[PDB]
Design a binder for this molecule. Structure first.
Ligand SMILES: CCCCCCCCCCCC(=O)SCCNC(=O)CCNC(=O)[C@H](O)C(C)(C)COP(=O)(O)OP(=O)(O)OC[C@H]1O[C@@H](n2cnc3c(N)ncnc32)[C@H](O)[C@@H]1OP(=O)(O)O
Ligand SMILES: CCCCCCCCCCCC(=O)O
Lengths: 200, 195
């Protein structure tokens, strides 16, 4: 019973924090307000979430898990891997824009000077590995290079998504993020060098 | 000579005591100027790093334009540029890290100033020009845009390397960025390629 009670307590604290972050802002909301809203002590809030960003990482992990189900579902349905890739970035751009105010402070956590926290953020948001799953079928199809691992190429594309999304959210939210992510995808997938146009 | 005296004094304190630990007050004293005078030249400490970075880039720019002039192949010049960047980043990691972080300073005004002081993307675009003229680069993206994307990959790689994982071979990491962005992840196995 204690296990269930702890999971329930963590979820209530999580819900309480997300609502406050949404309604009043992430930076403006304190651990004491979250604790009060979830009916726990300030000390208990920290036992579950050592720092406020850990709450956002939990949300990000949830978002990524949904994207993982979606990607696996599409591949299983027989969608072309490249189209699944384009779709993923399209939805990533759309979702990032919808949740901009919550995701921005989350993105900075991946740049935390403290390496333990940067690593924690990285492990909670493994987009690189999800991309690698889409590249896999391409490698088996013989159209993907094999001098670099799937994980390394996936990591690279995810790193680009990260920098584009962060700069978009922090400095140029008026620009078209979907267009920017499509640019990253095309450039890394096809390269800057021209390719063969098939016969009509 | 005050701008140069301040820069020199600041770099020496950073060298001997550390960038984070050094204060404007100490730099001013070491350069024999008031704190007020120091700020006219450098509004904030990281601006000294931008000046340093801008100078390193100017050096690379000379070397690059020079090699192209003497007929070196564009791709080879690009390969050279990144070998140089990897080596330099490794040698000056402690001072370059806070500079890299200033590039993502939440304050848009500061982020912009940093970007404009360190235009690596524009230099890469200069190197791509001969390739554009040969007609072998896609035209749905400008040279500046593609060059800036390759510079972004250098930034991401260098920041990770310097802040979290210096055990990686940074030179190979940058060659990987170059290979992937130039050639793409998709194979190039046309039995009859162009050229
Ligand atoms: C909806 C919102 C979405 C939101 C989606 C958000 C996406 C964000 C994406 C990331 C954005 C950024 O990180 S921006 C960059 C700045 N931030 C960061 O880097 C985050 C913090 N970074 C780190 O903690 C580190 O750099 C890591 C964890 C990323 C990687 O470090 P690491 O694993 O020690 O080192 P790495 O170079 O990866 O691996 C070294 C060798 O170990 C090998 N190796 C592989 N597996 C293992 C293993 N099980 N056990 C031992 N070794 C292994 C690797 O193949 C490699 O071999 P070999 O081939 O080398 O010989
Ligand atoms: C020898 C070290 C030279 C360091 C040059 C740093 C250039 C950083 C460019 C960052 C571009 C960007 O992604 O905004």
């Amino acid at each position: 019973v204690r296990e269930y009670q702890k999971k329930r307590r963590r979820e209530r604290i999580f819900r309480a924090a997300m609502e406050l972050f949404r309604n009043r802002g992430f930076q403006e909301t304190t651990a004491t307000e979250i604790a009060k809203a979830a009916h726990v002590s300030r000390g208990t809030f920290f036992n579950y979430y050592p720092y406020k960003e850990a709450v956002l990482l939990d949300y990000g992990s949830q978002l990524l898990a949904g994207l993982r189900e979606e990607v696996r579902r599409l591949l299983a349905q027989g969608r072309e891997p490249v189209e699944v890739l384009r779709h993923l970035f399209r939805v990533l751009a759309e979702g990032t824009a919808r949740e901009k105010d919550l995701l921005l402070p989350m993105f900075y956590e991946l740049l935390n000077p403290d390496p333990v926290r940067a690593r924690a953020a990285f492990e909670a948001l493994p987009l690189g590995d999800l991309i690698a799953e889409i590249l896999k079928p391409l490698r088996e199809q013989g159209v993907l290079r094999q001098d670099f691992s799937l994980e390394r190429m996936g990591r690279t594309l995810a790193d680009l998504y990260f920098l584009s999304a962060l700069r978009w959210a922090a400095y140029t939210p008026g620009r078209d993020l979907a267009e920017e992510l499509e640019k990253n995808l095309r450039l890394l997938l096809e390269g800057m060098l021209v390719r063969e146009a098939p016969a009509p």
